[PDB]
Subunit: 138 residues, 2 copies
Amino acid sequence: EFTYSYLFRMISHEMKQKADQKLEQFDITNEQGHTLGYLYAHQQDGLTQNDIAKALQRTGPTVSNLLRNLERKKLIYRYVDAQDTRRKNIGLTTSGIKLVEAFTSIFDEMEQTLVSQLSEEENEQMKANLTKMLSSLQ
Amino acid sequence: EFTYSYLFRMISHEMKQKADQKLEQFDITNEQGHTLGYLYAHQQDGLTQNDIAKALQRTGPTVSNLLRNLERKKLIYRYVDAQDTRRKNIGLTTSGIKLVEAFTSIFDEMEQTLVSQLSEEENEQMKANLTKMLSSLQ
DNA sequence: ATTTAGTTAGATATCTAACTAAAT
DNA sequence: ATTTAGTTAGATATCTAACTAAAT
């Protein structure tokens, strides 16, 4: 019986935490895992950073910064697109695809373990309640 | 239909942002708000930094860092505990107490604005399930 | 012995304000 | 001659590694 500030704060932090530990063996952070994971799914769209910035609900610098790390790992690649020299377009590298195929399990577990804690009727109402709340902030 | 991670992750983040913007009034960050708020509530006990870490579920360095930020602002003061010289007792300065008394509405404002989004039973379920999901992540 | 309490410093994530590089 | 894409400055928060100092 606590504050929503407390609850959402704690839960979120412990997911970054639990997931940071499991992701250790791949030398990435959860944020990095998620971005990588995102790129696995939607790179078909000739992705550019703003697009990612938009998808991750994070700022332009924040994303610039994360991508830079990932490219230092050579986990991704930014060809400076042709129509614009400003635009860098983002995609995985085999090494990054290999990585994604390899850690994706971790994310899936936590989800399942979570959605194991409840029954289908709950998860839909619960997850559908969550969505509603997120919007109100956003 | 979103993965739980996305939801907690996004929700907690914007809460920080909404809270952070509103607090801009007071020259403090969302976390500083929460820490001072705790200090205001439990100050009498009286807390060591490690007490704060446990309550806030944070590592020792992280608390050490925030407290210093709060100390710089002159909103808390700390001194060495006389019996156990290891410890530093943390307390709110008079300035800090007033500051809390000022900003507390915001935290309440946001908690309500969330609560106002569901039925009393829907909220009852919500907060209840969340505790369990929190628990399940240790 | 070993556990506790706190600091410091290098990473990453994040931010806003402000930059440069370059397309309109 | 002007937005617009991406980066940098420097701030907070967070973690671990590494430390010191102290208690049990």
